[PDB]
Write an enzyme that holds these catalytic residues in place. Structure first.
Site, PDB file in Angstrom:
ATOM      1  N   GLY A  22      26.247  29.630  52.190  1.00 21.35           N
ATOM      2  CA  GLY A  22      25.781  30.714  51.330  1.00 21.35           C
ATOM      3  C   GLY A  22      26.874  31.604  50.764  1.00 21.35           C
ATOM      4  O   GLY A  22      27.890  31.857  51.421  1.00 21.35           O
ATOM      5  N   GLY A  23      26.640  32.078  49.540  1.00 22.28           N
ATOM      6  CA  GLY A  23      27.522  32.963  48.788  1.00 22.28           C
ATOM      7  C   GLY A  23      26.761  33.443  47.575  1.00 22.28           C
ATOM      8  O   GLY A  23      26.029  34.431  47.655  1.00 22.28           O
ATOM      9  N   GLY A  25      24.904  30.938  45.942  1.00 21.73           N
ATOM     10  CA  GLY A  25      24.109  29.712  45.903  1.00 21.73           C
ATOM     11  C   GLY A  25      24.286  28.811  47.121  1.00 21.73           C
ATOM     12  O   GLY A  25      25.003  29.156  48.067  1.00 21.73           O
ATOM     13  N   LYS A  42      22.777  21.508  43.885  1.00 19.29           N
ATOM     14  CA  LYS A  42      23.252  22.888  44.002  1.00 19.29           C
ATOM     15  C   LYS A  42      22.152  23.806  43.470  1.00 19.29           C
ATOM     16  O   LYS A  42      21.618  23.579  42.387  1.00 19.29           O
ATOM     17  CB  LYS A  42      24.597  23.108  43.285  1.00 19.29           C
ATOM     18  N   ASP A 133      39.949  28.510  40.755  1.00 20.06           N
ATOM     19  CA  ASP A 133      39.806  28.334  42.209  1.00 20.06           C
ATOM     20  C   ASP A 133      40.372  26.973  42.645  1.00 20.06           C
ATOM     21  O   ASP A 133      39.779  26.282  43.487  1.00 20.06           O
ATOM     22  CB  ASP A 133      38.328  28.552  42.664  1.00 20.06           C
ATOM     23  CG  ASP A 133      38.099  28.798  44.162  1.00 20.06           C
ATOM     24  OD1 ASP A 133      38.995  29.366  44.818  1.00 20.06           O
ATOM     25  OD2 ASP A 133      37.019  28.407  44.672  1.00 20.06           O
TER      26      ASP A 133
END
EC number: 2.7.11.1
Length: 293
Positions: A22-23, A25, A42, A133
């Site tokens: 979790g974050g 999504g 996702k 990222d």
């Protein structure tokens, strides 16, 4: 969990298990009830403030037809959640590096993963987005006879559009809060400056030093500000002691870049190809994690 086990999405994708935490999504492994293969699913709740799935799907659709990108299967929206269905991949580069006897990859494995990652970086920028990222856990090897030797770029959650509809470079914000992983972040990102194409290249540079040397000087240090201060002062030339000599070209090229300047991806690719030529590394060579040779 957003979706329980055995839940079926659009009467086609049956949830098997959660694979990503979790974050903003959740990532699930599911069975495609039509094609019978397993897929990556996702999901983000429709009652969420920062809704990124829409942007991730826009990036994934724009990249279809390029190597090092998952095949787009489907997407949808409803009153409960938003979802995206994509091709499932295998082992990530962070878990592959950890599994190595000394936590290092041979230069053969390092340089070739380097070519593949640079191609996926050039591919995302050609469509007008920055990854922001770039890290080993965001890259995974294939899981099929046709893909087991192919490296894939994952997670477009922190991506940002840098070129508008007409291909013009968007203005940078004066301050841009950096929200990615600290370890492979460039000095610019640590400074909270607007990230550019070169910042994705800085992460690839630090990933490759970590792959070949097994460590970065700032490893284990968790405070973001301190890591950024260590990076700014660290003699990056001293990072290259055990790296091939051409990496000084890679380093001098990326150090000169700013937010507006298009990088010379060919000079960087030449740095890896000449590094491999000079030491007889071949493309057919087995990767470190492959046994029987």
């Amino acid at each position: 969990d957003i979706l329980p086990a055995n839940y079926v999405v659009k009467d086609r994708w049956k949830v098997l298990k959660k694979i990503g935490g979790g974050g903003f999504g959740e990532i699930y492994e599911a069975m495609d009830l039509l094609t019978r293969e397993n897929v990556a699913l996702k999901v983000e709740s429709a009652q969420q403030p920062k809704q990124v799935l829409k942007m991730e799907v826009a990036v994934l659709k724009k990249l279809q037809g390029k190597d090092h990108v998952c095949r787009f299967i489907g997407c949808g929206r409803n009153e409960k959640f938003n979802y995206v269905v994509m091709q499932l991949q295998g082992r990530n580069l962070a878990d592959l590096r950890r599994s190595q006897p000394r936590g290092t990859f041979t230069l053969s494995t390092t340089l070739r993963l380097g070519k593949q990652i640079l191609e996926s970086i050039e591919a995302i920028h050609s469509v007008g987005f920055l990854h922001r990222d770039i890290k080993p856990s965001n890259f995974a090897m294939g899981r099929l006879p046709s893909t087991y030797r192919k490296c894939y770029m994952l997670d477009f959650g922190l991506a940002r559009q840098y070129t508008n509809t007409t291909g013009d470079v968007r203005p940078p914000r004066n301050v841009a809060g950096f929200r990615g992983t600290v370890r492979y972040a460039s000095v610019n990102a640590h400074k909270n400056r607007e990230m550019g194409r070169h910042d994705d290249l800085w992460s690839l540079f630090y990933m490759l030093v970590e792959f070949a040397v097994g460590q970065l000087p700032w490893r284990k240090i968790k405070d973001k500000e301190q890591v950024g201060m260590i990076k700014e002062k660290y003699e990056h030339r001293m990072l290259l002691k055990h790296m091939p000599s051409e990496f000084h070209l890679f380093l001098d090229h990326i150090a000169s870049l700013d937010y507006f300047t298009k990088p010379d991806y060919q000079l960087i690719m030449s740095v890896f190809e000449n590094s491999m030529k000079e030491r007889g590394i071949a493309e057919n060579e087995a990767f470190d994690w492959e046994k029987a040779g």
